[PDB]
Design a protein around this ligand. Sequence first.
Ligand code: G2P
Ligand code: G2P
Ligand code: GTP
Ligand code: GTP
Ligand code: MG
Ligand code: MG
Ligand code: MG
Ligand code: MG
Lengths: 428, 428, 426, 426
Amino acid sequence: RECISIHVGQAGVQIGNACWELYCLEHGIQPDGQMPSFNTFFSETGAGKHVPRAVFVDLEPTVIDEVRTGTYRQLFHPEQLITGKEDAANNYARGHYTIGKEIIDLVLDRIRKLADQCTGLQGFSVFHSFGGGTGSGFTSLLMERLSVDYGKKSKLEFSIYPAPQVSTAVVEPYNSILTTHTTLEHSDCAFMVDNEAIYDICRRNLDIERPTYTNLNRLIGQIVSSITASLRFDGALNVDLTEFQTNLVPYPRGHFPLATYAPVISAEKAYHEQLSVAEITNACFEPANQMVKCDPRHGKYMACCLLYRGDVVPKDVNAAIATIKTKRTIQFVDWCPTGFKVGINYEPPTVVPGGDLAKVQRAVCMLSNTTAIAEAWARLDHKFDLMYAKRAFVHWYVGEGMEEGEFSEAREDMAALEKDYEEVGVDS
Amino acid sequence: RECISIHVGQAGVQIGNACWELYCLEHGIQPDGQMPSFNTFFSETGAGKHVPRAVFVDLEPTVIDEVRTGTYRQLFHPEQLITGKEDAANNYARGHYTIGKEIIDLVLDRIRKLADQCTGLQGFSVFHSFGGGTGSGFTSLLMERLSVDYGKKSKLEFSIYPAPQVSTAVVEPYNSILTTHTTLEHSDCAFMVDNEAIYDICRRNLDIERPTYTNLNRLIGQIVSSITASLRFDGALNVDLTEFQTNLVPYPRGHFPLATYAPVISAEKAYHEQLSVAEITNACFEPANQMVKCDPRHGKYMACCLLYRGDVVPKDVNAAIATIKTKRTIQFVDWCPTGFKVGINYEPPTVVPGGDLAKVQRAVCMLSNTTAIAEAWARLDHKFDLMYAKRAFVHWYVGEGMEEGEFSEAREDMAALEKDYEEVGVDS
Amino acid sequence: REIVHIQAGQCGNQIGAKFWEVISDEHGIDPTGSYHGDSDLQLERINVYYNEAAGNKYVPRAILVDLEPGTMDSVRSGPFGQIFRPDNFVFGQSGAGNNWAKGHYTEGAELVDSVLDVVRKESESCDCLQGFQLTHSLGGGTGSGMGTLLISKIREEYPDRIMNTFSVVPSPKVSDTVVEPYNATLSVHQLVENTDETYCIDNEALYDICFRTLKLTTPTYGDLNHLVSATMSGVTTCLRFPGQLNADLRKLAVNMVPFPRLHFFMPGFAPLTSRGSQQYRALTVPELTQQMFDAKNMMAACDPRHGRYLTVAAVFRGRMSMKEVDEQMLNVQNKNSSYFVEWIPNNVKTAVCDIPPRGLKMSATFIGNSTAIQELFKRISEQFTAMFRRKAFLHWYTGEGMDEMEFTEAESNMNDLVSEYQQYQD
Amino acid sequence: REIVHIQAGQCGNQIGAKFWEVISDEHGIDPTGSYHGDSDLQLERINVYYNEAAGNKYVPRAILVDLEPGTMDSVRSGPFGQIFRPDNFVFGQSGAGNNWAKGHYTEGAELVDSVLDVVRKESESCDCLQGFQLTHSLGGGTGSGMGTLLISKIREEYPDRIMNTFSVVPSPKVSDTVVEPYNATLSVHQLVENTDETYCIDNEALYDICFRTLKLTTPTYGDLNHLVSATMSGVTTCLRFPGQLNADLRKLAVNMVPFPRLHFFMPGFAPLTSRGSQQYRALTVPELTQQMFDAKNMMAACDPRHGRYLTVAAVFRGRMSMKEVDEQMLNVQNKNSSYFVEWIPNNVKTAVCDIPPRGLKMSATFIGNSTAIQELFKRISEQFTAMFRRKAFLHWYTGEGMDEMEFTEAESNMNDLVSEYQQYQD
Ligand SMILES: Nc1nc2c(ncn2[C@@H]2O[C@H](COP(=O)(O)CP(=O)(O)OP(=O)(O)O)[C@@H](O)[C@H]2O)c(=O)[nH]1
Ligand SMILES: Nc1nc2c(ncn2[C@@H]2O[C@H](COP(=O)(O)CP(=O)(O)OP(=O)(O)O)[C@@H](O)[C@H]2O)c(=O)[nH]1
Ligand SMILES: Nc1nc2c(ncn2[C@@H]2O[C@H](COP(=O)(O)OP(=O)(O)OP(=O)(O)O)[C@@H](O)[C@H]2O)c(=O)[nH]1
Ligand SMILES: Nc1nc2c(ncn2[C@@H]2O[C@H](COP(=O)(O)OP(=O)(O)OP(=O)(O)O)[C@@H](O)[C@H]2O)c(=O)[nH]1
Ligand SMILES: [Mg+2]
Ligand SMILES: [Mg+2]
Ligand SMILES: [Mg+2]
Ligand SMILES: [Mg+2]
């Protein structure tokens, strides 16, 4: 019941940096690899050194070099640090093919090595952005090959959603749309997260004046471990990744649950506050704590899963659920009666030294399949239209070999996706 | 059987400052929140810190900042300290709408948070002035929303009545009249208090040369706790807030009981004096101890309720009542035979360190529904007329969107109110 | 032979607290429920009021009911809270606000159904119920409201069992709430049809007893409710212990009710005087009868001599001769014949049992049924009409859903009761 | 006389963990397997559930089965893991994902064949099997899927042995997975044809018991599964120890099943109340029967009084008279005759044995068969249809290879069961 973590691009790697740091914090792992104690993510060598089961890929050396110069470079095996010599210029054409195609075989074989190291691989998780090159384009290439050799193993993807505020590439819509299609084709579950919503949480609930990616990544990393580490460690009601597939995807296409997380409270505001299971879950149904820029009250629910860490009793959860059903404004779709899944571990939430969040006694992760996701898609469609109407910058992809129809096609596929969410939301 | 205290404006907040200080004094609460011992007003966190169930709102930061810099800032939760960035300029138009409307949603949700924290909310009490902006206008807005979501919970309001002496806004009559209407529409019981009558008591019974608001607030705060804390703590004859509704309001409109309180005697004059239950209640029927500038001998009584603290025996009260009936000049209205309600706690009156009043062994709060209240209304009507005759300053509201007819309307509503008090006073 | 007691409202809760205290004293039951008595007779009829729990511990056959937790908790915190089982604590969390409509008509009904199930459970545990006893106020929301609902349901289920109740009667000098007459009227209306008898005790009179005869400067409910409990225990002494005459409550009912609708009683008690004079006392039956006849020792605020007697019941505790008691009580009728109604020769009936109250050699409980009682109904009906005519505060009951005619008819029945006392008066 | 028990899924594993704990307590068996009992009777029928290992150590006749190692390991790590032999730990390494198709139809089948060989081994070691007991969920993948496969194979091999199972029933307030109704329906479909009886216990009701009667603020599975184990041990007390009536499970089956397809039961238990009140308790048979009849002490989430009883079995532990039990249970039928079906005179049957549960003087286990049960099937069938109509999540089962008609027919049989309860209802 092991897994592999794949980090592509700076978005994937920098997030990964916090993720593995967190895993060290969860089990008392020293940077040197020495750890006296997580075998799902680490393998052990005869030296008593543990090695992260992960692959870090960046087509430009730069970020990988950062890894190589950091403290955890003694944790990572040199073969897991793979780099190219030039980026994809924020461009899928290069990421997916022109450049990335020259490295991907190395990458896949290192994955195989790890796959052979694992005895019972449940699956793997991938981190990347939607708008980058390496992070999007290369990622697409990668998933094409992984679904060939692994197939059936869990394909979890964590994708960063381009915000209107932050925008670092003018052709991000194009990059994102191309990517999206391929993730529809090969992922099992995609989680897109909006840095702009996260910033909002950090400035209001963590009270942070000036959020950076380093703080943003800490938040995300903890959420990801609450989903996985928490499954590995055992608790009361353990919930496997296969159960998430089974329970969260009603139709082959609706594989886009979103995440909301609480408690996200600064130490200073946590004093004085004690949240019950019910109260934390009430925070989880608030749009203001949503890690994606959309409105949960607008959309309808199809699936919802709550995962618990630390001090939680099933009974309290049962009461909390009743409250959500009655309080809310949780319009669930007829197609799914009642769909709330509950996983409860005993493992307590962990705290990062030099962190920005309070120590908490219980924590809740909300995963949910809601029709509000279409909203985000609509925003991207529009942006595409504008760029594509003029065909500004199109030569940067076409000149690398892309076909006009490929862009049309991908957009259309997203339009279909959104329409499918509409359809499921239509009660029947 | 819990409650929430809402403090709006400086009048509400500064009064509140003394109120929570008093609650600390009643139960030995440290500024840090630590208290070893009031659960109706405080919730407890796992740290053993107790948090005041209250919300403080000021559209200008200034006063809230004062709170934030005071000793009790460690008691208050940061989320309960809400501020805007500009006052209402003493003007309902801004308080109720232009400015206040932009914050009120925050406020209401913090109230909801507390409402969800309470298990059995009896209701809540609000402190504000009639003449201010935030205190009047914002308050109106607030009550409009609270009656929607809470409805039926107790709506007690403590309003400061503008004195002829103190007058800090030329459009106070206008502010007050607009407010009044809305309080008629949504409060359950309004208590208006005149700082000028209070000053008179402080200079004569407390012998204070120079009263300030800080001394004035202490007096009021104690009265308010004698009504509420005294219900929460249990005594002999406990009297709930719902009983006050039931017993003090004969018709939907007559919800304006006034307060009188005794003993209000300085330490120096208290030596040597011992007041019996009967004697204190005799002080309570004296106009000179009335906290509102009006004449109780002029008006008639419809309802009267006496609450007792400390060393009181029902029998002595029974005798005191007979004395009031026989001594007095308590012309009760035919519509209500005999209407005297008695609540007796065991909890002794408390003393504020550095206070201005003597330690007393028994204390009496008088609430009463009397026709003399019309007098005060008449004064306000007249003042309005003068301003409105010229239409001086009208552009400060109209320019913010108010309608001329709105002012006419509100006055007329007050005229109707006064006439209704007349009618009830007419014996039948 | 068993009785189920129910305490409703603070009045009920506190008076009953004293009652159960006394009853356990009667049988040698300590606050834990353990029996440490003096006599075999203490156990011999312990079943009327108790269940025998494992280990020779006893549980009072009674239910504590209210809408406010605090009261219930305060009772449970005192001695005798321990004797009650958790199963008998039925309560909500928000009082009625003194509103019969909230107690009877709405909110209280919600608890009443659970109360009744507990009642049923207890009646099933009993061998044979004799009856039910309720203690409550006539002016409060759960005392008069909830309690009357409960009564209509109990009588419905047990038509031949004795329904009696003890209740606190409003007075001009006591009155707390303006709608107290409204609550009283509504309860009376129901009680007159749904009970077999009710005792009318007025705090005013009780205060007078405490000061005037008991020489207390500070009458408290703790002592006032003590006096009530004395009379409450008096009426079942013979039931519980061997004696000579009239032990059964039904027998008493037969002898005390000449007409189905006149079932309101005037309790009183002897000896009732402070200790200062007790050293000069010499209790004899004439002494007890002097005190019991004297209106000043009545617990009801009403002087019988203003009206006329239909029935008198006197219960004697302790070893007195038959002659002494029967001669002297006959002599009361003989000497005060002008205050008795000529329809009934021998208006005074007696009960005599052999067990005295702890601390006294002899004692006597007075139950009167005199037409003077109508005055208490006048106080209520009058006050009612003043409010009702103007509809002051009515909206609080109409808010619950009560109809003006509901109150109108309630008044009508009160007027009937007074007229019937007048018809018998003279 | 022997019984083979199988624990399937976490539910099965944890409930069974408590069960075996209790059974060893019953016989004085310590966690090592060594016998240190109190009585000869503890050994006298130890063979129903145990093998005697060298050195007077005993091994539970039961197989632990799952698809997740961790669970199995956690059970083995606790007391009583030591009592189990390695031979009884059969498991895979990848759960079913709550998919009946993976448990029953595909993956679980792979382990089932090895489980069956162990079953066979144990049945060969036995002198004479009485039957089989399974503990599992109705909503999980191995609990309902794998377990039902196993059942079809066991019944196939042993047609005349008693197949009974205890299983956790979904509730609107419990429901974890969206396909839980799908798993339930499919399991029900099979269980109705392939078992002799199944007990329907609902966690919802169990939580209510824990708080309402047991006064626990935090109901946990550790205690909830305790309550189940009480009832599971109750049904074989007489089997294991001398008594007077109905020891055999088959006898009980004969008396509890009037119609081949209606074999779903409502377990309940007395005494079941917190310690606070226990000091006021006085257990008698009427007391036990009051608690057992009362729907609030049922472990199944269903009130019998909403439907009508076809059969009632009451098993008594501890020294009670014949009269007391037979009179009182007759009286239950007499007093509540409106809730019994008139077809069967004497609907209540009793079993009485002489050995009480450790810690109690007397105890009683309730098994009901009332038409009210259909409500639980309605909850499942209804939820099912909503999903099924839209085919939400169906693809996960069609991925395994399940046919829409497989589910359709499964529903059909559920509908039949409800209609049959209605046919008998009235
Ligand atoms: N002799 C006594 N009379 C009492 C006592 N407590 C109250 N009362 C009288 O009873 C009436 C008021 O009633 P309660 O306390 O019983 C009201 P209750 O708690 O039944 O209902 P709510 O309306 O839900 O509060 C009134 O005539 C009081 O004056 C007592 O302890 N002793
Ligand atoms: N009274 C109890 N019910 C339980 C317990 N564990 C689970 N369950 C209930 O059982 C169902 C879920 O099932 P499991 O843990 O038994 C699933 P199982 O492990 O058999 O199969 P998989 O699909 O391979 O995980 C559901 O109704 C849970 O709510 C328990 O310990 N006690
Ligand atoms: N949360 C989070 N988002 C990040 C981080 N780094 C970058 N991003 C976001 O991811 C996107 C940036 O992708 P890039 O860094 O430009 O590119 P890349 O995906 O690494 O690959 P190349 O384009 O080939 O360099 C933007 O939308 C950023 O806001 C990070 O550390 N944390
Ligand atoms: N008793 C008492 N009265 C006060 C206190 N502070 C102000 N008041 C009275 O309340 C009125 C003043 O309201 P302001 O302070 O002008 O305004 P506000 O209601 O806080 O709101 P804004 O107009 O928007 O600032 C005057 O009638 C004052 O006499 C206080 O601390 N105690
Ligand atoms: Mg990069
Ligand atoms: Mg201000
Ligand atoms: Mg009360
Ligand atoms: Mg499992």
